[PDB]
Assembly symmetry: C2
């Protein structure tokens, strides 16, 4: 049994080139070393009012994109959250072991889902005996609540849950017009999406901030440096060996980058469309993932219900 890694994927989330070359490209190559779990959290998504048609479409978009990146439905467990009842069941039970004050510290006319979703996050992770969690900086507090709830529950009932640990990377990709590239960027021009057409990549790379050194030379030190990090990650080349290739101006660099990133995204995107348009295949993937997820999750939930004192479902 390998270490279990759990990651949540927002249905509306837009994966950037930073998300891919930095983290997800490595995670794909390590699916034989870890039991990786990817949960498309549509129950977390409806804490914000959602257009139903866009929610359904975005869930399928996200599934197809992760499959396009190489997530293997048989090696890993990839599923839609609402297809696995155990998430809501454990979410309710852990409400009774979470303090109202803890949720208040997470930050009226908000809905109860926004207030309570940190408990559902804890259930998402603890269901699968998760060992490690890749947490963004924005999610640090949520992960520490999951640890505190797991320890509190185990102190009462015994070692039912594993106490999850945050996990660390690692290609560095910086925001183009402000050299870290983030999927949360309020400025779209700072990032390149995985579903970005070649023309828009060319336009964002050409417009990337750079330093007006005279004469313009290619050297790692913040604009020019970003393009060296991005190009090196795509081509697997050393930064200095790249500088050997560039006498050329910053326009040579920006052109070279844009061509490489678009070459890599094109291979990802054709896989994306082949999976995305095959709705029957996606239904099979969600069925396999949900059934595998529930089999694993029910082992933990039934031990939780046993310890709480519920009559076991006959």
């Amino acid at each position: 049994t390998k270490p279990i890694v759990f990651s949540g994927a927002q249905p509306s989330g837009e994966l950037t080139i930073g998300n891919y070359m930095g983290a997800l490209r490595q995670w794909v190559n390590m699916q034989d070393d870890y039991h990786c779990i990817y949960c498309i959290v549509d129950q977390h998504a409806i804490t914000v009012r959602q257009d139903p048609q866009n929610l359904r479409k975005a869930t399928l978009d996200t599934l197809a994109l992760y499959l396009a990146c190489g997530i293997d439905p048989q090696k890993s467990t990839i599923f839609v959250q609402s297809h696995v009842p155990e998430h809501a069941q454990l979410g309710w039970a852990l409400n009774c072991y979470t303090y109202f004050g803890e949720l208040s510290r997470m930050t009226e006319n908000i809905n109860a889902g926004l207030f309570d979703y940190p408990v559902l996050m804890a259930a998402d992770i603890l269901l699968y005996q998760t060992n490690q969690v890749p947490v963004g900086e924005d999610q640090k507090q949520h992960l520490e609540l999951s640890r505190d709830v797991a320890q509190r529950f185990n102190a009462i009932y015994g070692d039912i849950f594993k106490v999850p640990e945050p996990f660390i990377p690692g290609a560095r990709v910086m925001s183009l017009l402000e050299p870290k590239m983030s999927k949360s960027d309020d400025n779209r021009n700072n990032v390149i999406g995985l579903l970005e057409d070649p023309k828009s990549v060319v336009k964002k790379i050409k417009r990337a901030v750079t330093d007006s050194d005279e004469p313009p030379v290619v050297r790692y030190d913040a604009g020019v440096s970003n393009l060296l990090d991005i190009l090196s990650a795509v081509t697997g080349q050393s930064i200095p060996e790249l500088e050997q290739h560039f006498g050329k101006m910053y326009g040579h660099l920006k052109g070279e980058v844009a061509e490489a990133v678009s070459g890599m995204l094109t291979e990802l995107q054709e896989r994306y469309h082949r999976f995305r348009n095959d709705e029957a295949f996606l239904n099979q993937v969600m069925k396999e993932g949900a059934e595998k997820a529930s089999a694993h999750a029910s082992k933990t939930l039934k031990a939780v219900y046993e310890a709480i004192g519920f009559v076991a479902k006959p």
Copy 2:
């Protein structure tokens, strides 16, 4: 047939006031209504429980409702935790409930989130079954009204997915307050599973008045103690109260206490005979919980899948 939903705490301490008033009445209407009795063990854990006692009290409650006459073939009786759709809809309805609506729910220390959020789960329990009517007490009126508001709010967004639900024994030593399981002095309370000799003793010590000479006459204002014993006697036996005023003309209070104790005791001995039979047959209780949970899930899943389709979730394949 109209659908009626009632939640039963897994406590196993029904009082004779609860039975004669509420539960006994519903037992006779199982042919005219689709009655749903849900033993709400997920609500119970909003207060920390001893694990073994919770399990025992859930089976105690089931056996007790069975002995009172709830028929698992006419009605649907099940344990809440056996039907995952309750928690599933509970989470979804959180997103359509305002924080302030739960904050204004009066019914502390370091409260846990379940104690705050359980009114949402109550709404989920009711709405899963297209429920028409919920027989709540006065102290759960707010909870029912919140369930109605959430159903209306959801329907106003997505269309009519939910049905909107529709909008006397006293303490023996304190006959101006209704018989309460929470009473600190347990000699105020008669439970359905109270030993007959114990029930007769408490009835014998029930408060009365100081009329010289004693008079047995229904006047709640001046003779609360005697009027209470006449309501209990009228409830067990069905005799109209003026009949007992005529039967006790010239009789003393001790005669009436002997009459209430005997009648109450007889009712509790038939109920307890059935209870111990059901409760000692755990295989029978398991099969009732299995069947009840399958029926409950069959109806609940229809509503939950319609809710998920309106919200925009991908349908589970």
